[PDB]
Structures are given as C-alpha cells and as structure tokens.
Amino acid sequence: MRCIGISNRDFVEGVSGGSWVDIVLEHGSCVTTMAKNKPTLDFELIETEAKQPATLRKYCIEAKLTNTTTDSRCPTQGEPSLNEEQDKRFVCKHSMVDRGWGNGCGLFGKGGIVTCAMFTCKKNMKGKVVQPENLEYTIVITPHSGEEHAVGNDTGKHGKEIKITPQSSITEAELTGYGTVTMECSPRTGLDFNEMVLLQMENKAWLVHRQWFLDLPLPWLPGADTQGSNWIQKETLVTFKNPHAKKQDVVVLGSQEGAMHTALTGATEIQMSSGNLLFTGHLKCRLRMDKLQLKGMSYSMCTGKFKVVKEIAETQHGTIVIRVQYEGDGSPCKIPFEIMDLEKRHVLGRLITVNPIVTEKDSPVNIEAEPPFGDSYIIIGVEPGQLKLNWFKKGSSIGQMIETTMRGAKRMAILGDTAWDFGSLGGVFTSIGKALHQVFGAIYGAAFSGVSWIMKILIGVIITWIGMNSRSTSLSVSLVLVGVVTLYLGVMVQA
Amino acid sequence: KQPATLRKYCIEAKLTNTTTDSRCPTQGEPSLNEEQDKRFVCKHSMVDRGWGNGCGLFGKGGIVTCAMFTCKKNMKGKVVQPENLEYTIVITPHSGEEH
Amino acid sequence: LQMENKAWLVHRQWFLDLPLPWLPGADTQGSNWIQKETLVTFKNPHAKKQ
C-alpha cells in the first residue's frame, strides 16, 4: 500500500524495549515497519520545504560595458587621471603604451594609459540561506489495509500525511481504524543546514554548500543591497586588451550560464519556483507505537469460497501480492491466509499485510506475503473450497544475505552515522557503532573533500599497495578500514 | 580574402515538443517515430513500474524521452586556403623630413 | 573562428575536437546537429519519471 513497486524499500521489525523503533527515511525510498501485532505501516517522506529564505549574495552572470573612456599621459610624468575612476561602476586598469613625437608628446618613452567602462549587469544569480527552524517536512503514513486498488499508488488519499517542523512536538497521527501513532522526529539534525545555499538561475535552482558558493570567480554583490550597481569583483568578467604597445580596449566576457551549469555537477537540484520545495535528503524518526489497534481484531473467521480477481506477481525483494474477493456471507471477517510448504505440515513464510480482512461488501482485498525460497503452497480458505496456489520463488537463500549486506553498506555509504539509527537501542552495539563511525567519519570527513570519483580510487589503490608491502601487522589495518573502504566509497560516490 | 565556412557550432539552444513513452518491464524497449528524426534528442532509461503505475508484473520498465533541439546562436568557423592571402608592407626611407 | 562580433584565429584540430553540437558548412534548413548530447542533460530523479 503505496510502498509496493517502488524500489529500494526496506523492512524493520522489532519494537522491543518500550514501544518504539528508530527509522530513517530518504525522499527516494519508503520504509515498512512490522511487529508481532501493531499492523504494518508504510512511511514516505514526500516534501521538504523552506518557508522564509534570506538572500546571502548576488552574483552576476551576463553583463555589458557601455561608456568606454580612455586616457593616456606622456612618459615619466605620473599616471593618467580620469573622472570615471571615482565612481565604482566603472572598471579600470592601468597599462603602458609607448609614445613619441608621432604620438605627439615628446621624450620617446613608455607612457601610462587608463581605460574605463561602466559595468551594467543584466542577469543575476542569487543564493539564499535558511534557518534550521521554519522548515516543514511532509511524511505520509499508509497502513497495509489491503484496500481495493490501493497498492503502490503515489496518488490517492488512502493514508494520512502530517507536517513536521522543528518548532513542533510529538505529532500524533489519528489514522482511522488502527488507532493513533506518534512520532518523535528529529528535523534539525536531518540534512545539516547553516551550510546549504539555495542559488537560483532563471528557472532552475540547486543546493550547494556555503564555502563553495562564496568563493566563485563571478562578480558578486551582497544580499542586503538595493540599487545593485556596486559590483565588487568586476575584473573577473572583463578582459583588457593591450595587444601591441598601442592603446588598449575593454571587452565583456559573455554569459556564464552554461559555464556554471557545468560548475554545478554533483550538486542536487531543488525546485524554487513557487515555494522552496526540496526533494532530497532524509530525516531521522523515532516511532512510538503504543496506541495502534489492529482493525480486524474481534472479528470472526471466514465462511469460505474466496476468488482471486488479479493474478499474483512477485515484486522485487521477493514479496508476492494477490488480490482476492470474498464470495459468501458474514462479510466483516478475517481471511484464512497462510503459506505452507509441500505436504501441508509446516507454515513457513510470513505475511506483510498481517491480519487481512474482508470489509463491508464483496470488494476485493490485497494480500502481501513473503514466500520461502522454493516451491510453496498458498492457502486462502477453509476446507470446503480452498484456493491452493503454487508459487516458485527464485534464489532467495544466500543471495539475500549478500544483497542485504549491499543494502546496509550502501546505506552506510549514503547516510553517515545516521545509518546506525535504523534499529532500536542496541546499547553495547548500536551506540558504540555510531560513536566509532562518527569519529571515523569525522577523520574521513577531514580528508577526501574536493576529491572526485577517480582520485578516491587512485589513492585507495595507493593505500592498499602501502598495506600489502608493509610489515609489523600494520598491513591489516592499512587495508580493512582504509583501502577497500575507500575503494568502495570510490565506486559508490556521485549519486 | 575568400573565406569558406567549415563547421558551425551552436552556443545557446532551445528544447520544444517534449514527448515520452514507457512500456511494461519484461516487454522489451519503447520506441517512438520521433526517435529516428535527427532533430530530436533521445536517451533510454528505466523507471519503476507496478500496479500503482497501471502495469502489472512489478519490475523496471524502459522509457524514452524526446525534445526538438533548436539552435539560436551559432559560431561559424570559417577557413581559408594559403592563396588569396594578401599582405601589405609599407616602405619608407629615412628622408630627413618634417613630421 | 567567429562569434557574433568578436573573432579569433585557432587551429583546425583544436576546432574539430570541441564538445559542442555541430553542423557542416552548408546549412539550408540545417536541423541536423550532430553531437546534440553535449548541450542537453537528462535527469532521472528517484528512478521515477525522467
């Protein structure tokens, strides 16, 4: 239900300790929670919005030079003086021409010359900064009701959406039939603002960090500035041409729009047209589930004769999904759904739409379950008129251990120490893991910055070669945490 | 003297008439009649498909996208031959002569 | 080489290797730019629509 068919989804179960669990969720993925009760929910972060931005610095992109004036003076007598050097719209440069009697001054030396032209901008590029307050995520919560035609739809108001701010609180979600779920979200430490700048071309906008945005070779201008004429770094958008030793001239230096669309590689695009809608990053959510009902508890079992109305089809991650329809009487009831092996003894393989339900009519209902890694029967009824359905699930024996390992390592490569916040109070394992991971990410962060796709691989191979030829058991520490790790981060970078 | 242009690059362009086309995950690759037109730019990729996408079979279906590439600023690179290349040299003596 | 008003003097093999969409010396309803991929970029966010 809104989770199915979307790739890179993931499962969490275990609400141990109290009645909570830690989940972290990005904008691309969506998270399915499970328990021994407490019906399976689907969480997805759909918006990130910055409400009130304040501009930081306005850069120029396309300029023009009008009122080209120049002035020269005979050699060994000072510098030329010109009234347009006073006003700072005009860009200036001193150079040396050679003069004589043909140049009409005498003394046959190398005179001085100035040139001036006013710097009019006609295309801006403004960056904006936002506080870590006054920003408003939107997370949507969809229970596995198994409702008719509500599966994997990014459309549809089948689930509740709540808006969470750092000025907000425990944020109950009154979603009907199932009770009320509360979320202790941590939105301040989500994507690390007070570094991001939100620069903006004509109709596009990006998300770069502060120390990259400030030191650009474009002529800049501060944010609190009306009458935007006093451009400050004007000499990086003009060229002073003194080809021979004759008089010199000024030129404008084109448009750096497509030049800076080259410069904005590796910087995730956001959508600043109407509202500062981000669609990147994550946030960490503490999820308390003490007040979830089950919506199907205190219903009797079923009479029989179900009917499949849409053929089953496994997804990725090996979870089938079937739509069945009830034919019979006593319509609010459970569904006798179970996956058994051959020869009908063991009930192996679990459900994801746990406690399925027939509701209010003969409306078809969706059931998701996880079969075992071979052939297995599916039993969707009681004994007069069941529905035995064969199913073969490919692989799924040892490849989901290496596949789960690659999902965990990819999560530890994208997320930092926040990747350890995907489980519930390890104590001697989880807190120690993110402590060592945050000091190692601190050391690794104070290196490798500015280093691209290639050079992480290159000096990774260098560190492996220094390891493989060293002695005194520094070789193992010179491979296992630096060499192959920086090669893996060399491959899994620039998403 | 006689320049003949060799090749002209584009500087600033414009994209109109954006069309796209997707298809079911196991059912091969999509195709458009705009794809064989040389004034349209295309690149295959793939999306996620399922019952919410009105598809079935829950996989990764291919997708194409088109756009009519239109230029509006050119850079004509002309070239000349070594003949009809006409220099000009002034000759002047040291006539002791005013100005 | 020629811009709108400015003009340069570059050599051939540098001029032929610039990644930028091109078309031969006769335009005549050109509409046939060759390496068009160097001046567009196709975004596929989230493995959703592109």
Epitope: N153, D154, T155 | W51 | -
Partner: antibody
C-alpha cells in the same frame, strides 16, 4: 462533496476564440489536475484538455497541437479553456474532469481511478 | 488510433449484457488503465468502473469488467430500466494521451 461547475456560452462565429472556465470547489485546486474532453452531439468523446498541476504544464494532443491553448489561475481556483481558429465542426459540449496529481508536484502517471467528478458541460455553437 | 466498441446492444431485463472494446498494444493490451462511463442524455457522464475491474463508491456491485488480452469488457448482470444510457469507454496510452470508445446505446425494451 466535490463540485465542478462551468461557464455557459451562447453562440459563436467560425474563426473566433471561444472561452469557457471551470470554478472548482470541494478540494484544494493546486493538488488536483484538470482535463477538458468534448463530445459532438451523438458522437465520440474527444480528448482535448491537457495535464495541469500547481505549475500548469501541458501535454500536446495530436489533433489539436497547434490551435488551442489552455491557461489557469490558482488565485481564483479556476482553469481556463480557450479554443481559437473555430471551424464548423467545432461545436460540441465541453466537459471538465478531475484527476489527482502525484505528491511530488510533477505529474506524469495518471491516477488509476482517473476522471472522477465532472462538470455539467456547457454547449457552444458556430454558424 | 481509437477504440472499437459496437454501435448499440440490447437485451431482456434480467439477463447479462456484454460491451467489449478492442484496443492496441499501447492503450489496452499493455496497461491496466481502462475506465467505463455511462451518459444519460440530460446528464454529464460519471465514472462507472476503475482501472480494469475495480469499482467506484456508490454503484451496486453488479458492473463487472475484464481484460482478455487486447480486449476490455463490461459485463452487466441484472438489467434494469435505470440502465438506459450511453456507455462510453476510456483508456490511458503509453504516449500520454487518453483515448475513448466509439459508443454503445443500451436499451432494455
């Protein structure tokens, strides 16, 4: 609970620019799309309207690609349908349609249950 | 490219009537977007059947559809006098355009 109403048009001349609006109520307008389908009397339902959103994009129909333009306004919570270059066969009933936009703003995949609630339709004539 | 449902069908009140639409591989045979409508002559048509077989709220659980390849159907059990309407169809394509059916007139007497 969801109501869509239109603006009545009386009579037009061939070659003019007919215009019909759509006042929307019962929902937030910036999160649902708006379509425009037409039906000649006793004939087939011909799709004209294009996929709108909070930004207001289009998706050009094959038959009506270079003769019709649609606009909207979020501040009045309406959508505008303007067909120009009217010929003799353009007289029909003009319908509206509701569809739910994807939650990321950008709308390409339609809702499974597309075309839920429609307007009553206002007829136009050319002569 | 359109849909080819027949001109007009009729039957006795109480039996089953079938209304089929034959489509191509880009509008019906590939995707699960096919919706049904009914149109009274003094009424705007309302949505009558969802994606292939699913049903709107309201209507009384007797309008069953199917897709048997390139053909999409609408089987109506229990004909009544309130079912005299113009039954049109619709589908969403892979191109991005919506197509529609030709049009069937259903009478009971």
């Amino acid at each position: 609970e969801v109501q869509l109403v239109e603006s009545g048009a009386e009579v037009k001349k061939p070659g003019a620019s007919v215009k019909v609006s759509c006042k929307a109520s019962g929902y937030t307008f910036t999160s649902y799309a708006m379509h425009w389908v037409r039906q000649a009397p006793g004939q087939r339902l011909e799709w004209m309207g294009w996929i709108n959103a909070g930004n207001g994009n289009t998706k050009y129909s094959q038959k009506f690609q270079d003769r019709v333009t649609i606009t909207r306004d979020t501040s009045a919570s309406t959508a505008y349908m303007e067909l120009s270059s009217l010929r003799s066969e353009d007289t029909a009933i003009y319908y509206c349609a509701r569809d739910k936009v994807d939650d990321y703003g950008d709308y390409w995949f339609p809702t499974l249950w597309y075309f839920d609630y429609w307007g009553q339709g206002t007829l136009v004539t050319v002569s | 490219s359109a849909l080819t449902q027949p001109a007009s069908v009729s039957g006795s009140p109480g039996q089953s009537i079938t209304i089929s639409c034959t489509g191509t591989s880009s509008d019906v045979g590939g995707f699960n977007y096919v919706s049904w409508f009914q149109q009274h002559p003094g009424k705007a048509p309302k949505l009558m059947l969802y994606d292939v077989t699913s049903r709107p709220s309201g209507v009384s659980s007797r309008f069953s559809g199917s897709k048997s390849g390139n053909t999409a159907s609408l089987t109506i059990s229990g004909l009544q006098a309130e079912d005299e309407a113009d039954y049109y169809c619709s589908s969403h394509t892979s191109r991005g355009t919506w197509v529609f059916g030709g049009g069937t007139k259903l009478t009971v007497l």
